[PDB]
Amino acid sequence: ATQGVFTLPANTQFGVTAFANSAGTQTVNVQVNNETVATFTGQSTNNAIIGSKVLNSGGGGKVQILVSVNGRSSDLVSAQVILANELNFALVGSEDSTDNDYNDAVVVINWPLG
Amino acid sequence: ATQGVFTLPANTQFGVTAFANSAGTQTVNVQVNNETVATFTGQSTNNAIIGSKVLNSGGGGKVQILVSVNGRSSDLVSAQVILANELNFALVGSEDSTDNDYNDAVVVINWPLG
Amino acid sequence: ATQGVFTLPANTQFGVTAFANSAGTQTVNVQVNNETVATFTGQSTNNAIIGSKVLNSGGGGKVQILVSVNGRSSDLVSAQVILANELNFALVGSEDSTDNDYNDAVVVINWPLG
Amino acid sequence: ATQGVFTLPANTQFGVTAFANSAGTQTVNVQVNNETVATFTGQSTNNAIIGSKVLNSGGGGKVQILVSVNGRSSDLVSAQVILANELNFALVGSEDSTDNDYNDAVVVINWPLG
Ligand SMILES: CC(=O)N[C@H]1[C@H](O[C@@H]2[C@@H](O)[C@H](O)O[C@H](CO)[C@@H]2O)O[C@H](CO)[C@@H](O[C@@H]2O[C@H](CO)[C@H](O)[C@H](O)[C@H]2O)[C@@H]1O[C@@H]1O[C@@H](C)[C@@H](O)[C@@H](O)[C@@H]1O
Ligand SMILES: CC(=O)N[C@H]1[C@H](O[C@@H]2[C@@H](O)[C@H](O)O[C@H](CO)[C@@H]2O)O[C@H](CO)[C@@H](O[C@@H]2O[C@H](CO)[C@H](O)[C@H](O)[C@H]2O)[C@@H]1O[C@@H]1O[C@@H](C)[C@@H](O)[C@@H](O)[C@@H]1O
Ligand SMILES: CC(=O)N[C@H]1[C@H](O[C@@H]2[C@@H](O)[C@H](O)O[C@H](CO)[C@@H]2O)O[C@H](CO)[C@@H](O[C@@H]2O[C@H](CO)[C@H](O)[C@H](O)[C@H]2O)[C@@H]1O[C@@H]1O[C@@H](C)[C@@H](O)[C@@H](O)[C@@H]1O
Ligand SMILES: CC(=O)N[C@H]1[C@H](O[C@@H]2[C@@H](O)[C@H](O)O[C@H](CO)[C@@H]2O)O[C@H](CO)[C@@H](O[C@@H]2O[C@H](CO)[C@H](O)[C@H](O)[C@H]2O)[C@@H]1O[C@@H]1O[C@@H](C)[C@@H](O)[C@@H](O)[C@@H]1O
Ligand SMILES: [Ca+2]
Ligand SMILES: [Ca+2]
Ligand SMILES: [Ca+2]
Ligand SMILES: [Ca+2]
Ligand SMILES: [Ca+2]
Ligand SMILES: [Ca+2]
Ligand SMILES: [Ca+2]
Ligand SMILES: [Ca+2]
């Protein structure tokens, strides 16, 4: 299945935060309605935050996360969870290698904000 | 039900990150096996990160999140999600008022690291 | 927090299935936009299915699950999870006593259908 | 990532239930520690339960779900969610065609029982 693609409500502010846990430098691309609106880059084996931004979901509400290590696409896994019928998390794990820890870049999207 | 309480694997390094979305200054307490090991304090209405730390789960693996605003406990909601049978998120939302956005402090716990 | 309340997409077919794991006979009330549309009653300590029905979320999309055992409301816990940005589960656990297994009646709501 | 594979607690009773939503007859294979222990077959476009069983996770706790339609493997998506630090769901969607509703066979695994 395609992973890392989420439909948010239109015109909604959301947070995106990425963490790194790999020898490789991670590149996290964030697309909103098919345009790149943020790129986070960094390297850590101890969960450093390599980027955190507030974005708007725009007209279509489509948010897509892509992860690469020097242009090689990582394998992704994702899901969305809703608490209290209101608080949303869109979650991505990624794997750059063969150990299948899926933490090499971890991306958390949250809404609503404010 | 009790919310904000999670069993991690024993003696395991994990990440904890807190975001704020409220007029009120948020105080986030992290307990590991019933002892306070970290406290985050901050204020934002735009999802600012008010703390991020790496901790060890200790003998029992018990991690509890508590959130208060000027000493008044917020109402919590939580769940744990596991992706690819490996990547774990323990998720907390909190509500300091009556609008029930449950984002007033948002806490994300992730493991494994490295 | 209030639990067991979900906003589904409007006018959508959905499944609701209930499982029992308790000495006590479970009564599961399903409301759609604030009207009772199904009641499931049954007893099992081995996960028997005490009801499964197809319902429609109607104009407001509001779905609420309530559980009681011989006239006592059970304590609820709930969340919603979305896979492949499409497959939705709304999940309820309930507790009729003090052991906190939260499985005494388990309710699974799934959509889309067809 | 491999999907539909879960590590349950070892030696634990669990429920497995499958629903069908497709023109195609679904075949759901349940393996426990690499051995087939249940097969559910059926056809519905209205969420009929095509099987529900109680199983034990055995020494390794490994549970794998596989889905095929007339011998062709469906594409799987899965996650595990935990409520109240106690109630577990392992969730599987599958897609037998190109519409990506991922509901063609839906499989719910729940524990603890009793
Ligand atoms: C992206 C990366 O760092 N992956 C692997 C690393 O793989 C790189 C390739 O990506 C690159 O293209 O070629 C080089 C050789 O020129 C290399 O193969 O390989 C290292 C070393 O094997 C591996 O780190 C080791 O991972 C094992 C677990 O499999 C173990 O942790 C060991 O201690 C590490 O040294 C990289 O794996 C990534 O980083 C690790 C630190 C760990 O976080 C893994 O989960 C990552 O996938
Ligand atoms: C902790 C906090 O700031 N909560 C409310 C705030 O509540 C305070 C009480 O905590 C205090 O004890 O008493 C005072 C009055 O004496 C007050 O009731 O009230 C403010 C103003 O109403 C409220 O912010 C408003 O929230 C609404 C939505 O309900 C809306 O966003 C408006 O723009 C706000 O000004 C505080 O609500 C929190 O902060 C908001 C910005 C929002 O993030 C809410 O979700 C928070 O719960
Ligand atoms: C609803 C129910 O069956 N609850 C308890 C049960 O409680 C009932 C009261 O609800 C009723 O008001 O009074 C009767 C006496 O007339 C009784 O107190 O009590 C039984 C017996 O204690 C209890 O089952 C036992 O539960 C323990 C775990 O706490 C353990 O499994 C033991 O083997 C059981 O015999 C009922 O608990 C429920 O059913 C259990 C089988 C189990 O599924 C629990 O999770 C349930 O909550
Ligand atoms: C397994 C199955 O029934 N899949 C499709 C079905 O696909 C079959 C192939 O599996 C087979 O190998 O080849 C034949 C041609 O010989 C055929 O292509 O095709 C039917 C008809 O198109 C399709 O049902 C239709 O699906 C659309 C949406 O794409 C819509 O619901 C329409 O009303 C259906 O008639 C099968 O799709 C499956 O069943 C549907 C009812 C639906 O539940 C889909 O999600 C399923 O994937
Ligand atoms: Ca890796
Ligand atoms: Ca790693
Ligand atoms: Ca609030
Ligand atoms: Ca707020
Ligand atoms: Ca109980
Ligand atoms: Ca029980
Ligand atoms: Ca399909
Ligand atoms: Ca279908």
PDB file of N, CA, C and O in Angstrom, chain B residues 63-100:
ATOM      1  N   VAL B  63       5.864   4.023  32.305  1.00  0.00           N
ATOM      2  CA  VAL B  63       5.991   5.422  32.021  1.00  0.00           C
ATOM      3  C   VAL B  63       4.604   6.078  32.200  1.00  0.00           C
ATOM      4  O   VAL B  63       3.613   5.609  31.637  1.00  0.00           O
ATOM      5  N   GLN B  64       4.544   7.129  32.991  1.00  0.00           N
ATOM      6  CA  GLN B  64       3.297   7.868  33.233  1.00  0.00           C
ATOM      7  C   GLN B  64       3.500   9.342  32.936  1.00  0.00           C
ATOM      8  O   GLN B  64       4.480   9.938  33.373  1.00  0.00           O
ATOM      9  N   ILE B  65       2.565   9.917  32.189  1.00  0.00           N
ATOM     10  CA  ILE B  65       2.534  11.313  31.866  1.00  0.00           C
ATOM     11  C   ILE B  65       1.423  11.991  32.649  1.00  0.00           C
ATOM     12  O   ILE B  65       0.285  11.528  32.640  1.00  0.00           O
ATOM     13  N   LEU B  66       1.752  13.112  33.264  1.00  0.00           N
ATOM     14  CA  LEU B  66       0.759  13.943  33.968  1.00  0.00           C
ATOM     15  C   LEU B  66       0.881  15.352  33.422  1.00  0.00           C
ATOM     16  O   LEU B  66       1.978  15.804  33.154  1.00  0.00           O
ATOM     17  N   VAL B  67      -0.240  16.047  33.259  1.00  0.00           N
ATOM     18  CA  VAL B  67      -0.225  17.411  32.727  1.00  0.00           C
ATOM     19  C   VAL B  67      -1.070  18.301  33.635  1.00  0.00           C
ATOM     20  O   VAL B  67      -2.137  17.915  34.034  1.00  0.00           O
ATOM     21  N   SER B  68      -0.539  19.455  33.984  1.00  0.00           N
ATOM     22  CA  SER B  68      -1.261  20.402  34.817  1.00  0.00           C
ATOM     23  C   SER B  68      -1.023  21.829  34.305  1.00  0.00           C
ATOM     24  O   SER B  68      -0.035  22.085  33.587  1.00  0.00           O
ATOM     25  N   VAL B  69      -1.943  22.730  34.636  1.00  0.00           N
ATOM     26  CA  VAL B  69      -1.788  24.133  34.298  1.00  0.00           C
ATOM     27  C   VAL B  69      -1.958  24.894  35.620  1.00  0.00           C
ATOM     28  O   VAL B  69      -3.027  24.822  36.199  1.00  0.00           O
ATOM     29  N   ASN B  70      -0.898  25.552  36.056  1.00  0.00           N
ATOM     30  CA  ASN B  70      -0.828  26.232  37.349  1.00  0.00           C
ATOM     31  C   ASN B  70      -1.356  25.314  38.464  1.00  0.00           C
ATOM     32  O   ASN B  70      -2.157  25.707  39.322  1.00  0.00           O
ATOM     33  N   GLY B  71      -0.888  24.089  38.452  1.00  0.00           N
ATOM     34  CA  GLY B  71      -1.231  23.071  39.411  1.00  0.00           C
ATOM     35  C   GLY B  71      -2.542  22.371  39.288  1.00  0.00           C
ATOM     36  O   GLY B  71      -2.829  21.476  40.095  1.00  0.00           O
ATOM     37  N   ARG B  72      -3.374  22.750  38.326  1.00  0.00           N
ATOM     38  CA  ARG B  72      -4.650  22.070  38.126  1.00  0.00           C
ATOM     39  C   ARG B  72      -4.465  20.968  37.105  1.00  0.00           C
ATOM     40  O   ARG B  72      -4.013  21.260  35.995  1.00  0.00           O
ATOM     41  N   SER B  73      -4.814  19.731  37.446  1.00  0.00           N
ATOM     42  CA  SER B  73      -4.603  18.606  36.506  1.00  0.00           C
ATOM     43  C   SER B  73      -5.482  18.782  35.286  1.00  0.00           C
ATOM     44  O   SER B  73      -6.704  18.990  35.401  1.00  0.00           O
ATOM     45  N   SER B  74      -4.928  18.605  34.112  1.00  0.00           N
ATOM     46  CA  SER B  74      -5.719  18.505  32.899  1.00  0.00           C
ATOM     47  C   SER B  74      -6.308  17.122  32.749  1.00  0.00           C
ATOM     48  O   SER B  74      -5.788  16.139  33.301  1.00  0.00           O
ATOM     49  N   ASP B  75      -7.372  17.012  31.973  1.00  0.00           N
ATOM     50  CA  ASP B  75      -7.930  15.716  31.621  1.00  0.00           C
ATOM     51  C   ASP B  75      -7.106  15.091  30.512  1.00  0.00           C
ATOM     52  O   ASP B  75      -6.814  15.768  29.556  1.00  0.00           O
ATOM     53  N   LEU B  76      -6.765  13.823  30.629  1.00  0.00           N
ATOM     54  CA  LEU B  76      -5.899  13.152  29.640  1.00  0.00           C
ATOM     55  C   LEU B  76      -6.644  12.133  28.791  1.00  0.00           C
ATOM     56  O   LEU B  76      -7.591  11.479  29.243  1.00  0.00           O
ATOM     57  N   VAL B  77      -6.122  11.945  27.580  1.00  0.00           N
ATOM     58  CA  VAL B  77      -6.487  10.820  26.711  1.00  0.00           C
ATOM     59  C   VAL B  77      -5.208  10.254  26.105  1.00  0.00           C
ATOM     60  O   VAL B  77      -4.243  10.975  25.889  1.00  0.00           O
ATOM     61  N   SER B  78      -5.192   8.954  25.894  1.00  0.00           N
ATOM     62  CA  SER B  78      -3.973   8.334  25.380  1.00  0.00           C
ATOM     63  C   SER B  78      -4.231   7.050  24.641  1.00  0.00           C
ATOM     64  O   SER B  78      -5.307   6.457  24.768  1.00  0.00           O
ATOM     65  N   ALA B  79      -3.245   6.623  23.862  1.00  0.00           N
ATOM     66  CA  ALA B  79      -3.240   5.274  23.289  1.00  0.00           C
ATOM     67  C   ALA B  79      -1.817   4.926  22.896  1.00  0.00           C
ATOM     68  O   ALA B  79      -0.948   5.817  22.762  1.00  0.00           O
ATOM     69  N   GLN B  80      -1.584   3.665  22.595  1.00  0.00           N
ATOM     70  CA  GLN B  80      -0.278   3.228  22.048  1.00  0.00           C
ATOM     71  C   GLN B  80      -0.545   2.595  20.694  1.00  0.00           C
ATOM     72  O   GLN B  80      -1.511   1.860  20.528  1.00  0.00           O
ATOM     73  N   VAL B  81       0.311   2.911  19.733  1.00  0.00           N
ATOM     74  CA  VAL B  81       0.235   2.342  18.388  1.00  0.00           C
ATOM     75  C   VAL B  81       1.585   1.734  17.998  1.00  0.00           C
ATOM     76  O   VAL B  81       2.654   2.316  18.266  1.00  0.00           O
ATOM     77  N   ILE B  82       1.522   0.568  17.343  1.00  0.00           N
ATOM     78  CA  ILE B  82       2.707  -0.135  16.886  1.00  0.00           C
ATOM     79  C   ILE B  82       2.656  -0.384  15.408  1.00  0.00           C
ATOM     80  O   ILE B  82       1.647  -0.907  14.894  1.00  0.00           O
ATOM     81  N   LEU B  83       3.667   0.090  14.704  1.00  0.00           N
ATOM     82  CA  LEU B  83       3.766  -0.030  13.240  1.00  0.00           C
ATOM     83  C   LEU B  83       4.895  -1.001  12.879  1.00  0.00           C
ATOM     84  O   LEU B  83       5.920  -1.050  13.543  1.00  0.00           O
ATOM     85  N   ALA B  84       4.649  -1.775  11.831  1.00  0.00           N
ATOM     86  CA  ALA B  84       5.590  -2.805  11.341  1.00  0.00           C
ATOM     87  C   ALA B  84       6.041  -3.753  12.458  1.00  0.00           C
ATOM     88  O   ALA B  84       7.146  -4.290  12.414  1.00  0.00           O
ATOM     89  N   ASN B  85       5.182  -3.963  13.466  1.00  0.00           N
ATOM     90  CA  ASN B  85       5.464  -4.862  14.553  1.00  0.00           C
ATOM     91  C   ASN B  85       6.713  -4.489  15.327  1.00  0.00           C
ATOM     92  O   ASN B  85       7.322  -5.314  15.946  1.00  0.00           O
ATOM     93  N   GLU B  86       7.083  -3.212  15.282  1.00  0.00           N
ATOM     94  CA  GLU B  86       8.397  -2.799  15.805  1.00  0.00           C
ATOM     95  C   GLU B  86       8.449  -1.362  16.336  1.00  0.00           C
ATOM     96  O   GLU B  86       9.013  -1.134  17.396  1.00  0.00           O
ATOM     97  N   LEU B  87       7.878  -0.441  15.616  1.00  0.00           N
ATOM     98  CA  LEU B  87       7.959   0.979  15.912  1.00  0.00           C
ATOM     99  C   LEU B  87       6.784   1.354  16.816  1.00  0.00           C
ATOM    100  O   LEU B  87       5.634   1.220  16.409  1.00  0.00           O
ATOM    101  N   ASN B  88       7.089   1.873  18.002  1.00  0.00           N
ATOM    102  CA  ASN B  88       6.074   2.178  18.997  1.00  0.00           C
ATOM    103  C   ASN B  88       5.893   3.646  19.250  1.00  0.00           C
ATOM    104  O   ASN B  88       6.886   4.398  19.386  1.00  0.00           O
ATOM    105  N   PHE B  89       4.636   4.077  19.310  1.00  0.00           N
ATOM    106  CA  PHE B  89       4.296   5.426  19.740  1.00  0.00           C
ATOM    107  C   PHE B  89       3.347   5.341  20.916  1.00  0.00           C
ATOM    108  O   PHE B  89       2.334   4.641  20.820  1.00  0.00           O
ATOM    109  N   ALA B  90       3.597   6.097  21.966  1.00  0.00           N
ATOM    110  CA  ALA B  90       2.642   6.237  23.079  1.00  0.00           C
ATOM    111  C   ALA B  90       2.253   7.698  23.096  1.00  0.00           C
ATOM    112  O   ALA B  90       3.117   8.603  23.071  1.00  0.00           O
ATOM    113  N   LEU B  91       0.971   7.924  22.960  1.00  0.00           N
ATOM    114  CA  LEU B  91       0.427   9.246  22.582  1.00  0.00           C
ATOM    115  C   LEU B  91      -0.485   9.767  23.672  1.00  0.00           C
ATOM    116  O   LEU B  91      -1.296   9.029  24.162  1.00  0.00           O
ATOM    117  N   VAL B  92      -0.296  11.042  24.030  1.00  0.00           N
ATOM    118  CA  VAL B  92      -1.121  11.694  25.044  1.00  0.00           C
ATOM    119  C   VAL B  92      -1.645  13.019  24.560  1.00  0.00           C
ATOM    120  O   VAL B  92      -0.881  13.846  24.056  1.00  0.00           O
ATOM    121  N   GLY B  93      -2.926  13.232  24.788  1.00  0.00           N
ATOM    122  CA  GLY B  93      -3.569  14.550  24.623  1.00  0.00           C
ATOM    123  C   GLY B  93      -4.111  15.011  25.971  1.00  0.00           C
ATOM    124  O   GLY B  93      -4.285  14.197  26.900  1.00  0.00           O
ATOM    125  N   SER B  94      -4.246  16.311  26.121  1.00  0.00           N
ATOM    126  CA  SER B  94      -4.720  16.846  27.417  1.00  0.00           C
ATOM    127  C   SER B  94      -5.571  18.064  27.195  1.00  0.00           C
ATOM    128  O   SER B  94      -5.393  18.809  26.238  1.00  0.00           O
ATOM    129  N   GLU B  95      -6.541  18.279  28.097  1.00  0.00           N
ATOM    130  CA  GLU B  95      -7.509  19.340  27.969  1.00  0.00           C
ATOM    131  C   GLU B  95      -7.587  20.086  29.282  1.00  0.00           C
ATOM    132  O   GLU B  95      -7.839  19.515  30.340  1.00  0.00           O
ATOM    133  N   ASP B  96      -7.286  21.388  29.209  1.00  0.00           N
ATOM    134  CA  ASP B  96      -7.232  22.311  30.352  1.00  0.00           C
ATOM    135  C   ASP B  96      -8.508  23.163  30.548  1.00  0.00           C
ATOM    136  O   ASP B  96      -8.544  23.954  31.488  1.00  0.00           O
ATOM    137  N   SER B  97      -9.471  23.002  29.680  1.00  0.00           N
ATOM    138  CA  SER B  97     -10.653  23.858  29.574  1.00  0.00           C
ATOM    139  C   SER B  97     -11.868  23.063  29.065  1.00  0.00           C
ATOM    140  O   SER B  97     -11.933  21.856  29.210  1.00  0.00           O
ATOM    141  N   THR B  98     -12.811  23.745  28.378  1.00  0.00           N
ATOM    142  CA  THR B  98     -14.049  23.141  27.965  1.00  0.00           C
ATOM    143  C   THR B  98     -14.205  22.989  26.470  1.00  0.00           C
ATOM    144  O   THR B  98     -15.225  22.431  26.029  1.00  0.00           O
ATOM    145  N   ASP B  99     -13.223  23.394  25.657  1.00  0.00           N
ATOM    146  CA  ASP B  99     -13.403  23.312  24.189  1.00  0.00           C
ATOM    147  C   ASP B  99     -13.102  21.935  23.618  1.00  0.00           C
ATOM    148  O   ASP B  99     -13.420  21.644  22.480  1.00  0.00           O
ATOM    149  N   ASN B 100     -12.472  21.079  24.424  1.00  0.00           N
ATOM    150  CA  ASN B 100     -12.240  19.696  24.093  1.00  0.00           C
ATOM    151  C   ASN B 100     -11.450  19.525  22.796  1.00  0.00           C
ATOM    152  O   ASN B 100     -11.667  18.572  22.087  1.00  0.00           O
TER     153      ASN B 100
END
